Amino acid sequence: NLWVTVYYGVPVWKDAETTLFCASDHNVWATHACVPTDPNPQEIHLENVTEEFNMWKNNMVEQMHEDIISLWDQSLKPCVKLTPLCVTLQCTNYAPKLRSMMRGEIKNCSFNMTTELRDKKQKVYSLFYRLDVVQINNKEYRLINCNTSAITQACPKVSFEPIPIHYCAPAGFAILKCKDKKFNGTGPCQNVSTVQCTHGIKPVVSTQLLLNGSLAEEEVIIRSENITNNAKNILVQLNTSVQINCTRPSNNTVKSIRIGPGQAFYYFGDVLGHVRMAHCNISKATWNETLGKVVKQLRKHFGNNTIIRFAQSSGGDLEVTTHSFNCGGEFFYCNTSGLFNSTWISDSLILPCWIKQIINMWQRIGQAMYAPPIQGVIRCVSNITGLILTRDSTTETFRPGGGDMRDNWRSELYKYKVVKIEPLGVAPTRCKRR
Amino acid sequence: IRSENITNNAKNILVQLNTSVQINCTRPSNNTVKSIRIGPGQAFYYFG
Amino acid sequence: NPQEIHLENVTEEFNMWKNNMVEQMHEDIISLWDQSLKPCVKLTPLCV
Amino acid sequence: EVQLVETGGGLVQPGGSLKLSCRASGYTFSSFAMSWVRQAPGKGLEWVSLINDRGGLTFYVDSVKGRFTISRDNSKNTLSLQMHSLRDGDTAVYYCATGGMSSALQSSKYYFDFWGQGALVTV
Amino acid sequence: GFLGAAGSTMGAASMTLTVQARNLLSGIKQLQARVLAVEHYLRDQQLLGIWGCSGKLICCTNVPWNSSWSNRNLSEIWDNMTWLQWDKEISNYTQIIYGLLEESQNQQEKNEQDLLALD
Amino acid sequence: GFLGAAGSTMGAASMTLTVQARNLLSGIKQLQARVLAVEHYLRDQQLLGIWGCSGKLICCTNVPWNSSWSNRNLSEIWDNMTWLQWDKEISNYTQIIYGLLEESQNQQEKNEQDLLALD
Amino acid sequence: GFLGAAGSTMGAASMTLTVQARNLLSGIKQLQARVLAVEHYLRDQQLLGIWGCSGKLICCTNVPWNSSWSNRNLSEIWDNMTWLQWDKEISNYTQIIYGLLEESQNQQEKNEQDLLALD
Ligand SMILES: *[C@@H]1O[C@H](CO)[C@@H](O[C@@H]2O[C@H](CO)[C@@H](O[C@@H]3O[C@H](CO)[C@@H](O)[C@H](O)[C@@H]3O)[C@H](O)[C@H]2NC(C)=O)[C@H](O)[C@H]1NC(C)=O
Ligand SMILES: *[C@@H]1O[C@H](CO)[C@@H](O[C@@H]2O[C@H](CO)[C@@H](O)[C@H](O)[C@H]2NC(C)=O)[C@H](O)[C@H]1NC(C)=O
Ligand SMILES: *[C@@H]1O[C@H](CO)[C@@H](O)[C@H](O)[C@H]1NC(C)=O
Ligand SMILES: *[C@@H]1O[C@H](CO)[C@@H](O)[C@H](O)[C@H]1NC(C)=O
Ligand SMILES: *[C@@H]1O[C@H](CO)[C@@H](O)[C@H](O)[C@H]1NC(C)=O
Ligand SMILES: *[C@@H]1O[C@H](CO)[C@@H](O)[C@H](O)[C@H]1NC(C)=O
Ligand SMILES: *[C@@H]1O[C@H](CO)[C@@H](O)[C@H](O)[C@H]1NC(C)=O
Ligand SMILES: *[C@@H]1O[C@H](CO)[C@@H](O)[C@H](O)[C@H]1NC(C)=O
Ligand SMILES: *[C@@H]1O[C@H](CO)[C@@H](O)[C@H](O)[C@H]1NC(C)=O
Ligand SMILES: *[C@@H]1O[C@H](CO)[C@@H](O)[C@H](O)[C@H]1NC(C)=O
Ligand SMILES: *[C@@H]1O[C@H](CO)[C@@H](O)[C@H](O)[C@H]1NC(C)=O
Ligand SMILES: *[C@@H]1O[C@H](CO)[C@@H](O)[C@H](O)[C@H]1NC(C)=O
Ligand SMILES: *[C@@H]1O[C@H](CO)[C@@H](O)[C@H](O)[C@H]1NC(C)=O
Ligand SMILES: *[C@@H]1O[C@H](CO)[C@@H](O)[C@H](O)[C@H]1NC(C)=O
Ligand SMILES: *[C@@H]1O[C@H](CO)[C@@H](O)[C@H](O)[C@H]1NC(C)=O
Ligand SMILES: *[C@@H]1O[C@H](CO)[C@@H](O)[C@H](O)[C@H]1NC(C)=O
Ligand SMILES: *[C@@H]1O[C@H](CO)[C@@H](O)[C@H](O)[C@H]1NC(C)=O
Ligand SMILES: *[C@@H]1O[C@H](CO)[C@@H](O)[C@H](O)[C@H]1NC(C)=O
Ligand SMILES: *[C@@H]1O[C@H](CO)[C@@H](O)[C@H](O)[C@H]1NC(C)=O
Ligand SMILES: *[C@@H]1O[C@H](CO)[C@@H](O)[C@H](O)[C@H]1NC(C)=O
Ligand SMILES: *[C@@H]1O[C@H](CO)[C@@H](O)[C@H](O)[C@H]1NC(C)=O
Ligand SMILES: *[C@@H]1O[C@H](CO)[C@@H](O)[C@H](O)[C@H]1NC(C)=O
Ligand SMILES: *[C@@H]1O[C@H](CO)[C@@H](O)[C@H](O)[C@H]1NC(C)=O
């Protein structure tokens, strides 16, 4: 003899996909539309609540990807569009005074650029990296993108430095944070807590190696959608960071010319001192220990008596064959073949790096950006907090892979799930309406 | 036959048929289409 | 015929230099000006 | 086991006041409704008052609505009753009882599960 | 705290209804999210109003429990079960219950109108 | 008229509550303003609902006045004071009062549920 | 079904009020349409609240029928007339009725407050 009683405000929630708000504490990522963060955010532990998570079906990754691309494009829109730069270049090798086994990496290109008035042209001598030009057939060159896309110049006043971005639930929704140590990105999570916003996630854009991210609480964690499927990427989250010191040692001098009313073109003018190659320093012992830990964790899935071999990326665009990253305002492409070249059976390392000014990001074709050169010598120190690996028999072979930015977000968003609150419910009580 | 004002010559008359009339329309010439690049990322398609 | 209601015995402290209606009017006037100019001839060829 | 132990007064002149205090153990006090049931020395028993598990609701027999107040302190595991204007017809043994009501989300009671030993109130 | 009772029993969680009720309401994509959140909130409030529960968080009704929906004891539901488990167990019966609640309130409104019509 | 009672006493102004209640509700920037105005309105209606005042403009409650919040006489508040002055005097106590009102209604809802459970 | 009673008598149509009530709520141009639809819904709910009808679909009041608004018999209105015809016949009197309903509820709220003030 029980009756239906209606309850509103019950702690019941169903998985849902919604739009999250942006919050943050010139900069390409800083946005005036992001709400100031909570000076002391509340986190509520949900005792005795088990929630099934799946980081590869987490729609927060797709929103972050869309928001990062949208902010990038909005930043580039109010900037100089270098349409006049797709001209025939007449290039010679930079040829510095001293011999340096890097001849031809920097070219001294002469071209006729536009100016403030449409009846005059200005002869310009600019330095370009070898990777930014192709030969037409002094030799004639064109920019790599004049065949595919127009150049939008990034504004020199807007920094590319990643800043933390917090994603906050809209009212009616909640974000569940896993907090289950050694959680592998899928399955039941027993330490679930409710948060108003995510932690601060830096929009670090890199391939192969994950920089300035979160670290594992106790052990290296290997996460994959399907560990046996060779077409899926493996995200390795480290418990200890590996410090990487990357520099652009050449003292590049930046020059600027006016190309139209209100428009100026910034270009690599000269090199002071000697030409020196960009490079990254990784401690050899630390990396060797890091790989030993990764191999142990991989053996847990692939077999205690198998052989794990690391090798360089087999091919594709430089974006995916090298470790792409941006620090100091410059875009670096580091080989990494010295880090993944070993077979694991039952003082410092230096990585050569190339720098590019014409960057095609977010694997898009048709929208190229020109990164202005940064005056002086630049150096950055960052933490390697995770790896991206792919897999190709007793011996298994792993390669850096990478290139899909969604996986970089996944390495931070794997702990969060968005749920819709369903405040209505009914239950039988001994309670009859009058 | 539908019109806003049937007696007003300035208004159109819309005639809705109860049976359709089949119309077979063609461009019988075997036109060959060519394409040239006119700028970075831009191509012009023309009747070749 | 807009309504105006006198508030008898109400004293309110005003400050015209902290009045956010000025900033909105400034933004709206600039926005309308720019919207009006957008669909108009851009005289790029005149810088000769 | 479950035990209810009454503490209270003795002989009080007609028209005065007396308060009983009943301690309980062996069960969660806050999970059960409590009642007081009265038995005159030569009669059977009658219900006098009922209090909910939380203490918010109290019910009384019409003849005692203006004289008796029932209250409960769930932190002290104590059920007390206070009576004023003690009439000659109110002399009796007053028993604590556990049961008699439940708060909608529990199975029905409408009976008394546990009894104390009884305080004797005389006039 | 908000949803802190999610792992608690239905009885214990029924005492925190105002925490979630308060937290439910608390460019184009964000406006769509806010308008949709408001529409959802209003749909739930309208649905409570249709049932005669417009001002209550705990609203008792005149619809009996069929026992086919769930044949569990009150102690099994209120003391040994959470709201997430309960919601999962009867997720296939909420439209039947909602329909019965709407019909029952419509009958109640007609009965109240007729009782008020007695001079 | 709208806000015409703002300079009047609290008693006199309490008789015009429907004028302001009606007037409260009556591209991107304007949509944000309208959505926010709706969210504010709904927050106030939800808050009244939490207190059991969902359908009333003048709603009496079971929360006693502490006298620490204000030790003024009823004539001082209702005959010799305006709502703006009153709001200023207790602006530091409205969260305490709101919390007490929410707790009191939660207790009332549980008591009503238990009273309805008596066969 | 939604509006299926539109051609039915007022009596028959009064039994389907929840169908339309549920259906009423169910880039820039669409957001404006949705925000306006919400504002209209809330204006109607606020207006019912002002009259003391916040939780009812059929709400009886204390305002007498003047007979100048319509001198028809109850059978003529409820059995021989539809809601569209009725709405047309009194379209010139709805503001008078709404004003009287608001005044009557304001008087009722003051009377309830004074009755609750009797110790
Ligand atoms: C990972 O995080 C570290 C630390 O936040 C990043 O290194 C930092 O990068 C910024 C921007 O390049 C440096 O600021 C610069 O400092 C020089 C100092 O002379 C100044 O001239 C510049 O104008 C600018 O202020 C900052 O010092 C540097 N910190 C350290 C410790 O090196 C790193 O870049 C991040 N990794 C990635 C991939 O973004
Ligand atoms: C790019 O090449 C031009 C031409 O070879 C360089 O300009 C010459 O610089 C030398 C420096 O000793 C002068 O003697 C010549 O008279 C210059 N000729 C012209 C036409 O300018 C220019 O310096 C080179 N750019 C860089 C950065 O090395
Ligand atoms: C620039 O234009 C002149 C003609 O005015 C031409 O002779 C010269 O070769 C051009 N320079 C380059 C680098 O194409
Ligand atoms: C030019 O673009 C085509 C596709 O449009 C591409 O296949 C080709 O490789 C590009 N040229 C160079 C030198 O990369
Ligand atoms: C859940 O959190 C508690 C906190 O003390 C911890 O002891 C427990 O190990 C956590 N669960 C898992 C699976 O780690
Ligand atoms: C790198 O890790 C160390 C570990 O203590 C931390 O102190 C440092 O701030 C980290 N740096 C970055 C850029 O995350
Ligand atoms: C990191 O993880 C390895 C296992 O992969 C473990 O042996 C090591 O102690 C851990 N170190 C820290 C600092 O957590
Ligand atoms: C992650 O853990 C779950 C635990 O149920 C397991 O089923 C799944 O296969 C694991 N995946 C990987 C890549 O280790
Ligand atoms: C995972 O990959 C294996 C092949 O290695 C395939 O047979 C299996 O169906 C895949 N499972 C999923 C869930 O993708
Ligand atoms: C780079 O060259 C500039 C030239 O003015 C000089 O001031 C600066 O100190 C140099 N920096 C380094 C690191 O050589
Ligand atoms: C990076 O630079 C700092 C500067 O003090 C140095 O202490 C650290 O050892 C360097 N790391 C590597 C891997 O070279
Ligand atoms: C370190 O390098 C040596 C090189 O011989 C290798 O044998 C060893 O497995 C590596 N890892 C550790 C943890 O020593
Ligand atoms: C691999 O070694 C670990 C060491 O603890 C052991 O627990 C695990 O069962 C071993 N697996 C196999 C397949 O031998
Ligand atoms: C990295 O260095 C090795 C050295 O043999 C070379 O074969 C490889 O092509 C280099 N990687 C890239 C991307 O150039
Ligand atoms: C359409 O029908 C109506 C019927 O009232 C008639 O008044 C009107 O003139 C007609 N129009 C045409 C164009 O036939
Ligand atoms: C229709 O047209 C006639 C002229 O043919 C004109 O006299 C009449 O007023 C028009 N009526 C309307 C409604 O336009
Ligand atoms: C049109 O010409 C093309 C030329 O390759 C031929 O393949 C095609 O069949 C021709 N179609 C007709 C309808 O003549
Ligand atoms: C979780 O379960 C334990 C079981 O001992 C219980 O004591 C605790 O109250 C539960 N937590 C909540 C929030 O109900
Ligand atoms: C209970 O549900 C079953 C299945 O829908 C139905 O056949 C039965 O008539 C229902 N009983 C009551 C009393 O509603
Ligand atoms: C304003 O104050 C005067 C004082 O004489 C009073 O008569 C009048 O009613 C007040 N106005 C209002 C709107 O209450
Ligand atoms: C009145 O307020 C004071 C200060 O907050 C507090 O100490 C006191 O207990 C309150 N009294 C009541 C009856 O709420
Ligand atoms: C329409 O009118 C007919 C008249 O015979 C009546 O029988 C029927 O019920 C009416 N329809 C509705 C929906 O009321
Ligand atoms: C009825 O309406 C008329 C016209 O507005 C008005 O003069 C009359 O006083 C009204 N009677 C009542 C009782 O409201």
Residue numbers in the entry:
A (entry chain A): 33 to 57, 66 to 141, 150 to 185, 188 to 309, 312 to 323, 323A, 324 to 397, 412 to 457, ...
B (entry chain F): 272 to 309, 312 to 321
C (entry chain E): 80 to 127
D (entry chain C): 1 to 52, 52A, 53 to 82, 82A, 82B, 82C, 83 to 100, 100A, ...
E (entry chain B), F (entry chain G), G (entry chain I): 521 to 546, 572 to 664
The article reads:
The N332-GT5 molecule was designed to engage antibodies containing a specific HCDR3 motif (derived from BG18) but bearing diverse VH and VL gene segments. N332-GT5 was designed to induce diverse human BG18-class type I precursors. We conclude that N332-GT5 consistently induced BG18-like type I B cell responses in RMs.
We produced a subset of Fabs with HCDR3s ≥ 20 aa that were not BG18 type I sequences and found that 7 of 8 showed detectable binding to the BG505_B23 trimer by SPR and 3 of 8 showed high-affinity binding (KD<100 nM). We determined cryo-EM structures of two of the high-affinity Fabs (RM_N332_07 and RM_N332_08) in complex with N332-GT5. Thus, an antibody having no recognizable BG18 sequence features other than a long HCDR3 can bind to the N332-GT5 trimer in a manner that is highly homologous to BG18. The approach angles and relative heavy chain-light chain twist of all seven N332-GT5-reactive Fabs clustered around BG18 and its inferred germline, whereas the other N332-dependent bnAbs approached the epitope with a wide range of angles as has been described previously. Thus, the BG18 type I and III Fabs structurally characterized here have clear potential to develop into BG18-like bnAbs. Furthermore, we provided evidence that N332-GT5 induced a wider range of non-human primate antibodies with a common BG18-like epitope footprint and binding orientation even in the absence of substantial sequence similarity to BG18, which suggests that N332-GT5 can prime a larger number of BG18-like lineages than originally anticipated.
